[PDB]
Amino acid sequence: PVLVLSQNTKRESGRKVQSGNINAAKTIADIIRTCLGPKSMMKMLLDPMGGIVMTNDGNAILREIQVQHPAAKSMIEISRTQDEEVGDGTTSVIILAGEMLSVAEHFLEQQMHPTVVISAYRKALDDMISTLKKISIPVDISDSDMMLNIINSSITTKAISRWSSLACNIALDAVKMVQFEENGRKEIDIKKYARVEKIPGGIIEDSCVLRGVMINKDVTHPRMRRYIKNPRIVLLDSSLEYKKGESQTDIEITREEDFTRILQMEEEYIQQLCEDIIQLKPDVVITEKGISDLAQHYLMRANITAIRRVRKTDNNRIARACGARIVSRPEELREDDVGTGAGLLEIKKIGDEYFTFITDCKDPKACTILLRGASKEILSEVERNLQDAMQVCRNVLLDPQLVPGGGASEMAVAHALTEKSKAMTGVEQWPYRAVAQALEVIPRTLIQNCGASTIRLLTSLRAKHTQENCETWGVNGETGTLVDMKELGIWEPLAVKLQTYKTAVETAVLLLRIDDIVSGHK
């Protein structure tokens, strides 16, 4: 019993693993193939913890799928990459990566070394990026109608398309409201300053983006005012009760006037803190930490509404909305740290909970979407679509370029680099044109999804696309018919398309580079 390696080590090598790799990728391309396009079908996933996730987007589909094949793990990783970078095109990139791996399988089988296939893929990626940038149509940022059209195009393929004309607007407002500048730096920080909050039960079109911040808190005391006209918001980081401190103290009492004296000193310190926070004459005070009973008594004496423990993110959003500044020591609170700009503070009751609104700000740089619906899953889906729309709007804002959708860009770049290929002489032309025909999958998937005969329809699409000045000619998946995207008005941001092509080719290269697998070790 002599073993060079461990007992749990397993080695696999040769063509087989390559084949297996491709197979694994295609399997994931086989799961989300029917979720692409305006006629996408809902997919329901059972959470291991007991929940339900009803989605269409690729990343929210592959996040709840547990796979043991490492190539499948790489596919899930590219899905997460596409979600995190640009926020759209997840199913598109997964489908393209899978089908480019499949079309490379043919050359792999024909005793062709993978390095030439990788080089051809890289050349094709460079050419496709170039010809995708070539056909871009510039957008006007200030045109609200054009941005509404772009977001509607990005959102018409998902659940909230029925309320698109509403939800679109919401997204735009948020992306136009978190927009910020400071020290020569622009943020559009949707993640931290554009919160989306879901309250089950209501009507979809009752949802709206607020000119302020809504959080799920209530006044600490019943007598504090629940309706303020022009509050002077002050934010606190520290607490307003007496605390032990850090160093060990162990005070020693011998006289008969030291215990009551100690308690009176504690009360006097709290009173001093409250008087010092009142000195600036605020109207509503928000703190992350607790409020002692005596402290809120003194705050009531000066007609101040106090809100108890609030999460740090909510306080940052409130500070950004009111223009206030979070402070820790009330001894060091200035006038410029008092938040003027909030136009209303409402302690309203929704269902059986109390929600506080700081709505109607002067120029808030942080918003909140009161997103009302019917169920938690429905609101979760609407939340995902709203995030998609925000990401698309941000991509347009940071990049003024557009590119036709519906499959027109895929066929356009395919034809362009095929015409480029038909001139170059060498052995690398075959994988190059293989990638060219590989991009044809998106129109094919759209036609298969809408329920049309893909063979002659796609042949006619290619034939019509061979004619010049027809690079905007795509397929309408609503009825499955050759249309012009200019008259259909569907365009996707160039960022999403180029990112999708780049990462698809890159991950195809990664999975195509590997020919050995060693499994089992610690």
Binding site: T27, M41, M54, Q66, D250, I253, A374
Partner: protein, 526 residues
């Protein structure tokens, strides 16, 4: 196979399979839930793991307490619980409408049809139905009689006749005593207190409050006639120094001086109260009550009892607000300044001992802005049933108050809406119009079961109802005692506009989301 190849221990249900399983689960839930809708329904008896008995007729209670684990069952269950947490009624009709929409969609899909056009028909039908509902409601003035009618229509559904009548009287009387010129209707102001006590018809409304506490000190008075009230949040309990105190003496006399000094602070705190009481009014047996959210030491308890003061400790946080809105005083977090304006008034404060527990009744107030409902029951499950009924009735009355409108009941609105949808069906173009038809037929699930639970045949009653509405546009619904068409407004069967709107919205949305499903997955286990 796809996924099953990547994940050997995974579940996959494809398009036809997903539709079949979804519709089967919806039909099962509908078949279980259809036997409780309406006042003629049958109560269900539920036993948990411990073995406690719960009688119910609610859709939400039954649907949460039912022992199922199906996914779509959970989806519709939380749809129902959200619809309950916002409106407060119409949760059985929610799942019934879901079941019927899904059944009709399966009926029109099994003929080889794509669900997308059925959902388009659902959207068009939802729009037309919303316009019809908006143009069919009656906008009146929410007087006492209208509120009694709405509360009766809800509670008689929930419970039997006499108990429903008593509860409707109590609910209307309570809700009229909280409303102001604005429209907050803070339902938190309504205590719902329970007592395993005399018969279930003895539940009633108390103008003041009922507190599950009492006078802990044995010598404290058990009944004060005209009481001043002092609600406080100060701690009369002994509180040690926060910063690591500790005593150091050298003789027994020093120890006695130390214990006196230790008591001195709280003794002064209680001295403030006693001087306040004597200054305000000590004479003529005018009682003084101190109600403290925090604790009260035995020393302070005895000191207050020696001065004819009744004191309650450890009261609820909401009871501070309820008392300061009912007794008219003011909640106090400190005793820096005490003035006679800080005392509320009470016309009778007394204590009733039930079994081992004690309760304090504060009533005979001049004008309470917060009342309580006292429920008396011979056993726990009756108390829980009455609590659920009271919740549903209060929510229905509040929804009636919020918007000045109300819809005819007894299934009349569904019949009229379906007739209007059938009339509008030619207008919508494409084959998807048949989907609208399904929606219309789906609505008929509501009136039909009203006859089904009453013992009459579905077909004859439905055709009799629809012939009367077609002949004359009068809103006629099912008469559960005869089966003939009866006008809902004339008989007084009223329903909430918000409830019907929420049904028409949520049912359509969730049915549309379910129909679009083509793959049910279970993966994520390692």
């Amino acid at each position: 196979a796809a996924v099953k190849t990547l994940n050997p221990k995974a579940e996959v249900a494809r398009a036809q399979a997903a539709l079949a399983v979804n519709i089967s689960a919806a039909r099962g839930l509908q078949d279980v839930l259809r036997t409780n809708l309406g006042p003629k329904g049958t109560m269900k008896m539920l036993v948990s793991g411990a073995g406690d008995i719960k009688l119910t007729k609610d859709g939400n209670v039954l649907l949460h307490e039912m022992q199922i684990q199906h996914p779509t069952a959970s989806l519709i269950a939380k749809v129902a619980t959200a619809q309950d947490d916002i409106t407060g009624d119409g949760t059985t009709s929610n799942v019934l409408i879901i079941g019927e929409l899904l059944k009709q969609a399966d009926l029109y899909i099994s003929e080889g049809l794509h669900p997308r056009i059925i959902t388009e028909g659902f959207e068009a039908a939802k729009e037309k139905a919303l316009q019809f509902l908006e143009e069919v409601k009656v906008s009146r003035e929410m007087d006492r009689e209208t509120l009694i009618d709405v509360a009766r229509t809800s509670l008689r559904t929930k419970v039997h006749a006499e108990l429903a009548d008593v509860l409707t009287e109590a609910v209307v009387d309570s809700i009229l005593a909280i409303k102001k010129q604005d429209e907050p209707i803070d339902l938190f102001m309504i205590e719902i207190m329970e007592m395993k006590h005399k018969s279930e018809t003895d539940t009633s409304l108390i103008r003041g409050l009922v507190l599950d506490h009492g006078a802990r000190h044995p010598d404290m008075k058990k009944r004060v006639e005209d009481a001043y009230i002092l609600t406080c949040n100060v701690s009369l309990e002994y509180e040690k120094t926060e910063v690591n105190s500790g005593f150091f003496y050298k003789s027994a006399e020093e120890r006695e001086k130390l214990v006196k000094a230790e008591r001195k602070f709280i003794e002064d705190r209680v001295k403030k109260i006693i001087e306040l009481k004597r200054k305000v009014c000590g004479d003529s047996d005018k009682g003084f009550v101190v109600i403290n959210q925090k604790g009260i030491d035995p020393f302070s308890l005895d000191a207050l009892s020696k001065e004819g003061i009744v004191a309650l400790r450890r009261a609820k946080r909401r009871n501070m607000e309820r008392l300061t809105l009912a007794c008219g005083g003011v909640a106090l977090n400190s005793f820096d300044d005490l003035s006679p304006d800080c005392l509320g008034h009470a016309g009778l404060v007394y204590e009733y001992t039930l079994g081992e527990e004690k309760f304090t009744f504060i009533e005979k107030c001049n004008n309470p802005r917060s009342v309580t409902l006292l429920i008396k029951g011979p056993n726990k499950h009756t108390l829980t049933q009455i609590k659920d009924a009271v919740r549903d009735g209060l929510r229905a009355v509040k929804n009636a108050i919020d918007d000045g409108c109300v819809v005819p009941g007894a299934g009349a609105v569904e019949v009229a809406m379906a007739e209007a949808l059938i009339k509008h069906k030619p207008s919508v173009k494409g084959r998807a119009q048949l989907g609208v038809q399904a929606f219309a037929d789906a609505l008929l699930i509501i009136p039909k079961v009203l006859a089904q639970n009453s013992g009459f045949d579905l077909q004859e009653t439905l055709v009799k109802i629809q012939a009367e509405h077609s002949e004359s546009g009068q809103l006629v619904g099912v008469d559960l005692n005869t089966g003939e068409p009866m006008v809902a407004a004339e008989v007084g069967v009223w329903d909430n506009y918000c409830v019907k709107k929420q049904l028409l919205h949520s049912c359509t949305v969730i049915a549309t989301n379910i129909l679009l499903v083509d793959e049910i997955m279970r993966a994520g286990m390692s």
